[PDB]
A paper describes a structure:
We determined the cryo-EM structure of the prefusion stabilized SARS-CoV-2 Omicron S ectodomain trimer in complex with the bispecific antibody GW01-16L9 (FD01) in its native full-length IgG form, revealing 6 states of the complex with resolutions ranging from 3.47 Å to 6.11 Å. The epitope of 16L9 mostly overlaps with the RBM, while GW01 binds outside of the RBM. From different states of the Omicron S–FD01 complex, we revealed that two scFvs of the bispecific antibody synergistically bind to two distinct epitopes and induce the RBD-down conformation into 3-RBD-up conformation. Thus, although either 16L9 or GW01 alone could not bind Omicron S tightly, the GW01-16L9 bispecific antibody could bind Omicron S collaboratively with the help of each other.
State 5: 3-up RBDs, 6 scFvs, 3.87 Å. Then, in state 5, the third FD01 binds to RBD-3 and induces RBD-3 to the “wide-up” state. The same triggering process then occurs on RBD-2 (State 3 and State 4) and RBD-3 (State 5), allowing the binding of the second and third FD01 to RBD-2 and RBD-3, respectively.
Residue numbers in the entry:
A (entry chain H): 3 to 114, 124 to 247
B (entry chain B): 24 to 68, 79 to 141, 156 to 177, 181 to 247, 261 to 349
C (entry chain I): 3 to 110, 125 to 251
D (entry chain C): 350 to 620, 641 to 646
The structure:
Amino acid sequence: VLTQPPSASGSPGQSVTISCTGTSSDFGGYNSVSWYQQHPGKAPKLMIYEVSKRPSGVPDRFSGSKSGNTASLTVSGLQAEDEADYYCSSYAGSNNFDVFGTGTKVTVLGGGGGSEVQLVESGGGLIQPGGSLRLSCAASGFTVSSNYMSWVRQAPGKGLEWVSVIYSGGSTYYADSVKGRFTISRDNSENTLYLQMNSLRAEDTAVYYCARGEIQPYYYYGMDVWGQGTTVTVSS
Amino acid sequence: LPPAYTNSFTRGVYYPDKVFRSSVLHSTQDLFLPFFSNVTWFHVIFDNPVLPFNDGVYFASIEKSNIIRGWIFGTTLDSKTQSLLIVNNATNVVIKVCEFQFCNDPFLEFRVYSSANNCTFEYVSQPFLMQGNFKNLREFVFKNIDGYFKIYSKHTPIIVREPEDLPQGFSALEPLVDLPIGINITRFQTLLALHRSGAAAYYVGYLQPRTFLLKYNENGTITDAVDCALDPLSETKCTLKSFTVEKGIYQTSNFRVQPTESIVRFPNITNLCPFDEVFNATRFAS
Amino acid sequence: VLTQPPSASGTPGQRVTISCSGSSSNIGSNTVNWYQQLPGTAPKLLIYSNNQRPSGVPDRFSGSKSGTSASLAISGLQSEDEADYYCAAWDDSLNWVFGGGTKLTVLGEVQLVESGGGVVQPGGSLRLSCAASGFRFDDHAMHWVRQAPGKGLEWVSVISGDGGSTYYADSVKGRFSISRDDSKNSLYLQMNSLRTEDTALYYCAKDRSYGPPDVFNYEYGMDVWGQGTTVTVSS
Amino acid sequence: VYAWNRKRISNCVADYSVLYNLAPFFTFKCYGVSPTKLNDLCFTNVYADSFVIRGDEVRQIAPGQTGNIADYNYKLPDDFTGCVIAWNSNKLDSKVSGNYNYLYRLFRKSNLKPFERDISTEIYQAGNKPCNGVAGFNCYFPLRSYSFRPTYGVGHQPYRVVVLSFELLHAPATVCGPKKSTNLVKNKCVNFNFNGLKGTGVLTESNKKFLPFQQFGRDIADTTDAVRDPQTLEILDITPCSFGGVSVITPGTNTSNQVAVLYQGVNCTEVNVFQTR
Ligand SMILES: *[C@@H]1O[C@H](CO)[C@@H](O)[C@H](O)[C@H]1NC(C)=O
Ligand SMILES: *[C@@H]1O[C@H](CO)[C@@H](O)[C@H](O)[C@H]1NC(C)=O
């Protein structure tokens, strides 16, 4: 559980400088606090991973220095037309999920990845409550069996949280939400990598996102590419 | 080389255990060198054969200063199995049971081998194990048991300058090293200090399981030993614990002629089975 | 289970020897801890890891772990050493077994205060709070060590400094929920399925280790205690 | 963690009681046996393997467990008979100058074999491309350094962890443990356990000239008579304890009841009093 401001609209692009408090430490080990810009519709896009050295993108958002006990991402002078949600990641302790933060409305105005590797899902329209549904993110580019991928779900209103982490060949760690009722199983080593529902408990209605890289122990990986999700729409 | 052979006199009676005895006669049963046996006369005037190590050997050396130094005991002398390269370098002895196969040939600088593998023992013994017409004889009884590679030794400064041959006189060997390393060994390889930039000849006997009656001195050393199967007189000296047999007839062990052939005669073959009439017909059954 | 003399005796001037017997599953594989508690006041650490002593504990105490049992020695006891001595050890079955107490009677700065007690309706209960003041809560673990009036002490649950894996006792498992928050020094313990057998003090004990006392079997101890509230359900 | 020592130690008296007071260790969990009984068990050779991990990773060193370090740098099977001795080293392994010296091999292809060391530095190839050496979008450094700093908290500090693997192959054991001793008693029938040679007797001072290699000593007919002191060289003599026959001389139960007691083989000074042959 982290601390983030509910909304931020006063003084658009001049003194916003949103951050995420509630750490009370020195960010544990590797001081790598990522910032995700979740936009309604398409999947979120990476903005910055370290405190500096922003990736290839918009150059008007940098200087995310760790002031006190929080990473103050300087966003002033960026623009005056945006409708998205900024999320920060921290608490890099060993086997600690829910590294994301609460929904921060950083809309300065309010009113006013596709061909990189691949983006595919299963399209779970009208999912029967329970059963066993498999969702895949087949990637014709980067290897779907050697890199470290993850699965993160988000529901309407609530923020994102770590749901599934899978290492190279010998780790199948599960999140604390499922506590064991979720069984990750890798598909063919040269075709794709799918998941398994295993009798959901009416809380898996959130939309899924299969990310090619880790969230809290994030690595550069050349580029951060996401994929559009699908609505579960359980009928319990 | 055509290896010759010499008559090994009474020599090679080592201490079986470490027990003090004063003026007694101890009848031990262990691996000893049979008296009046044949020992190869390998001369080092070039020679380096591979000898079979069945159950124990008796090595000798009449070198002058540093001719015969080192031992290459091992099973296969390959990189698969382990080996033993106990050598005698400058005022030190290096003992490693590492599995150094070979480089080109056992000659010697550590030019004996050139490789690197996993080792199991590095017992570097600091105390080394080794007069015009005064040579030096060095005897070593190498014996391997289930969990010890015991090595005996004795250094006697012989005086006679006769043709190269084993001297006359009893001389026991004193243990110096008790390496507890295990290993399955079976081959013996020797090597000499080449140093190119009748010299010496090593004698290599073979031990056998026999009984020997040893006489201990009042100080605690063995003065002499008598075998039990060498002559009808030694058996009398073994059946009676005394090296001075009185005049008379004494009953020794019994003899029994063991058989040679083995015949097994059974009754005549008759009353065969009618199965031959079963497997040969036209209409058999349904 | 640990065997300890219930009520020993002693004379002034000389020394005594309090012992604590335990099997090889708890003492043989871990280190014993000796705690001293004066009658009326909160307990305090006396000997940890059987070899070292805190800065406040003088050289008047010594401990040994010869074999599978622990042995205490107080060279030159006095009237101030008239207190209760408790043995504690972490067993390999994910539990913290305490002693019974030794009535060694002889007749001749961070506050860890907690609260949240009070008589409540049986069956249900309320939350147990705890607090401190600037002691690096992230780099320390916390224990719940309750003590019934007149009876001994026992371990309830443990939370590590990382905030991940936590352990409970054999009787409070399942119906108890211990957790912390990203706010200032605090500790929240929710209790469920009240059986009226919980009349104790629920000491919010401070530790010095970081992880749970299962991987660090040589540094686990217990720092200065705190004044707990007297919760008496009494059905 | 990617290049850890494998010190094969043998031929010593492993006194594990000393290890409890060398340095202020923070972990002494032994999975195989108990340290009290460990000092009485012989072993062939001990494999010392040391490395440095964080505080939150000490839990990953267990006989069977997954993790970023448990299956990528060092794995222990379900037969570890040693200990997991470890201690914090945040006193000399943390300076504010940039700690780009360690690594933990974040990238790997599969789980390594337990008790294996992979000293490699090739660029990680994530398939579907031949990487003859390049750093972008397909192949990255499979190594990543730590961020140990002095002004940090416990959990992410340099923790030195050293394990002592034990093994018993078809070879005689070398390391057994420390052996104690007691003060010698002379001219008194007591028990002795000298180097396995057990018995009872009166250890007296002899004048026998033992050989420099002989340790024990027997008699004409299978009986120990003298042994060498395992301490500084001294020639003793082992004579059996005081034993004898008791006989009663009695004038008969018809005139009186006074009797005499004769102990055979006793100098009187070892039980009026008279000493006869
Ligand atoms: C053995 O230890 C004792 C006591 O330290 C010492 O005096 C003696 O010289 C040592 N060596 C021998 C000969 O046992
Ligand atoms: C008995 O003891 C006395 C005094 O020590 C001694 O002179 C004498 O020789 C001893 N005799 C025997 C039989 O031990």
